[PDB]
Amino acid sequence: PPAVPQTFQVAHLHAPTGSGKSTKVPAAYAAQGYKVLVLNPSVAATLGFGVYMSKAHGIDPNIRTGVRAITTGGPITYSTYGKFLADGGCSGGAYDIIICDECHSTDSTSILGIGTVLDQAETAGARLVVLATATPPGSVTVPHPNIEEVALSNTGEIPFYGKAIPIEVIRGGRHLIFCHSKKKCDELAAKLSALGLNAVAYYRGLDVSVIPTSGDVVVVATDALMTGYTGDFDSVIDCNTCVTQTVDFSLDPTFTIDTTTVPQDAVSRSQRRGRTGRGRRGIYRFVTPGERPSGMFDSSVLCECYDAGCAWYELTPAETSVRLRAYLNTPGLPVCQDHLEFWESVFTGLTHIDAHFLSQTKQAGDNFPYLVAYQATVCARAQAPPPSWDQMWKSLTRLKPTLHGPTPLLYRLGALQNEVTLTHPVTKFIMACMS
Amino acid sequence: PPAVPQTFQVAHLHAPTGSGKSTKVPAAYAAQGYKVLVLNPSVAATLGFGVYMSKAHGIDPNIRTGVRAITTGGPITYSTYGKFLADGGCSGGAYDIIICDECHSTDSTSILGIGTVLDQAETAGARLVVLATATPPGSVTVPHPNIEEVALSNTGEIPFYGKAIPIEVIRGGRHLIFCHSKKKCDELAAKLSALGLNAVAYYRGLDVSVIPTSGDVVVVATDALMTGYTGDFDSVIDCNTCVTQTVDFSLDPTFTIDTTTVPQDAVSRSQRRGRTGRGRRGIYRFVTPGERPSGMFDSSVLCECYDAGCAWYELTPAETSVRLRAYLNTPGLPVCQDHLEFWESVFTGLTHIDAHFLSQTKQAGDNFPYLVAYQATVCARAQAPPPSWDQMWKSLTRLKPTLHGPTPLLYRLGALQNEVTLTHPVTKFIMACMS
């Protein structure tokens, strides 16, 4: 375990999940006289750390999540990145060590949360910052000893993502097919069922009950099937793609943030293939050979950080920018395009949001409550209608009649159905930010 | 992979389960021109090998189990040890290589099946015999990176096998306690439930449904909980014992074969502890520190081999003895006391069994159909009653009224309730065999 410098250092730590990096390492530091803060992306994990420490080691840590903060007075504190951020980052002289667990995490809260530690830790009196992860950036899918990988060809009856699955390969036994969209699943399952196979689609919503615990079955699922479920699969056929939130600078008039099918990750190909080979030999068929390493993320994620600093943490775009610059400036972490100045300038021209609309979108929990609450604000002041009436724009429901005219489009979040103008003063500010 | 000698050799092979030792190794041998026979203890595994080979490699092996034998003409044949034995062992010039998979298996059929290959393989024209296993004899439980081991003390409220479980350690979260007997489970669960915990007993019979997939729960199970079930356990408390079939030369009048609680195995302690530490850090509490290595078996298992040669395979005790002597004479396999001459002599004096009683016990599928069918034979001829009326002695049901007198005890298989004599001519033959 990295030693505490006399001044301040940023160390990396790569160890398996559950091997002690988030419990026993911190317990040893404490035994040394240090006050330790361990940050993690999930509340279940965090809560889980507190259960282990006190029953295996007799240590009752302070546990801080967005629901409650539990303080016992222990020199170790487990917190969520979001709670950490909500708590305003580093508090002078509180900790000597700060372990940023799952530092490879590409969700906005982890990124901003880590950029924050990096930026504020030394000033706060911290002598050591640990970047702990079991999935280092740039990781690739490596060969698996219990699994045979066979490339799908164009030879097969069932067509599948440009390639084809020969029927004999799935008629008989328990197989799992990974489709990128719930509709694809519905389409393939009905196609296989039609052909004579026991085929069931699965995704977010249904219950695992839908999968027979035994008997030949051909599951056609999305990543909604937790890698923990798994029911004796002789093979796994992967489409090798997934849908992700992406930003497009489409100049229509500004940028677009939507969900798009993108080539899969080393972490995705490994997790999907990982459902075979347990207890016996498995088979993995794919459409394309691995290519994308882990640890890369979309600029739209940077947009999410500014939105979150604006909507939840009381940070001006410049403050967010410094926190994020510290992250982008620390090596060994996931990477993205350097779009800081751009997103900063944008959020900067988004003045005078309606705090009632903002308070509304936050509470609903959907993505980009700021950008959503801000398009609504612009819509109301112009008695214009929202881009559409998707539940995304429901903060503007109580006034649909009041609203008429084209929509004054600032940017495109998801799909638009109403007519639109691109002359609003703010649409132009952002257009001017574009590039 | 071991190379085929010009004459004949016995090689060992230690590789993980599913790593290719039972599929890809054989596929390479075949590609070399060899005819390969792969023997395995389970029909599911065997059938499983045939599914993999043909869908991953295009090889349709001959698959032989006790239900049916499927022949395609492939140079690879997967068979069960029992079917192999039923088939009469090695057939001259059939195979060049014979892989005895799961060679560490201590069930009678595996042992006799392997002793048979060893004894007959070279004569049959086989140039190589492979002893493949992923659990080599003498194996010990090694430290686990994701699991913390904490020894139970005498301090705790809940008493447990001479030691004690402190309640705080299991009140809250998901725990699993391994009890050695279904009644122990019933007793502890009711004890914990009484104390205020969500505690459910589990064993052979009930349905896993009885375990809540979520919520604090304290499962008190026996090894009936397949290591595949596992439902997010923060800890595992192991009693460190198990019940096993053992022979006792109790001289009352002869020997006794019963189920008895014996210190656990390295394979048992590893499998039980293995239910924590998945996806996170686990805790394992035990009553005693590991001690018994894998690969040792009871002499009663040798009795089972003679019984099986007598009841199923048409082998005289001397023939069984030579097959078993080959096994006991090959190093790198599980071990037992050298009790060959003893069990041979015994089964040797068991002449003229009633083939109707024998045919009856075989069909029922219980243990020692020969020894059971032989005590019955002795009982009927003496119009005496069976040791008891446990379903064990049901071949003698259709005549309970006809039967009266003390039971003429040859040996004790399980429990006896009827009165008994020890003067029968065969009881004495066996007494004379004793030592």
XYZ file of C-alpha atoms in Angstrom, chain A residues 17-20 23-24 52 55-57 145-146 148 168-169 171-172 175 279-283 285, chain B residues 17-20 23-24 52 55-57 145-146 148 168-169 171-172 175 279-283 285:
48
model
C -12.579 -6.056 -6.270
C -12.965 -7.344 -2.739
C -9.285 -8.099 -2.252
C -9.058 -5.562 0.590
C -11.383 -2.143 3.655
C -8.159 -3.718 4.845
C -17.632 -5.631 6.656
C -18.085 -7.376 11.728
C -14.698 -8.556 10.465
C -12.537 -5.936 12.117
C -9.116 -20.269 -20.165
C -12.595 -21.742 -19.835
C -13.854 -20.900 -26.665
C -27.784 -25.725 -35.229
C -25.538 -23.736 -32.953
C -31.108 -25.387 -31.219
C -30.414 -27.536 -28.199
C -27.755 -20.048 -24.975
C -18.149 -24.654 -13.921
C -17.403 -25.966 -17.397
C -16.194 -24.949 -20.845
C -18.056 -22.183 -22.641
C -18.481 -20.794 -26.102
C -19.574 -16.006 -30.652
C -12.305 -27.623 -14.721
C -13.396 -26.404 -18.126
C -9.935 -25.319 -19.221
C -9.960 -27.848 -22.080
C -12.447 -31.488 -24.735
C -9.627 -29.635 -26.440
C -19.404 -28.608 -26.614
C -20.863 -26.952 -31.523
C -17.433 -25.457 -30.840
C -15.352 -27.882 -32.852
C -7.860 -13.047 -1.499
C -11.466 -11.900 -1.226
C -11.473 -12.801 5.712
C -24.141 -9.200 16.538
C -22.139 -10.993 13.901
C -28.049 -9.871 13.144
C -28.073 -7.691 10.067
C -25.323 -14.929 6.382
C -18.179 -9.553 -6.096
C -16.980 -8.151 -2.786
C -15.120 -9.027 0.401
C -16.392 -11.937 2.464
C -16.099 -13.332 5.936
C -15.968 -18.165 10.567
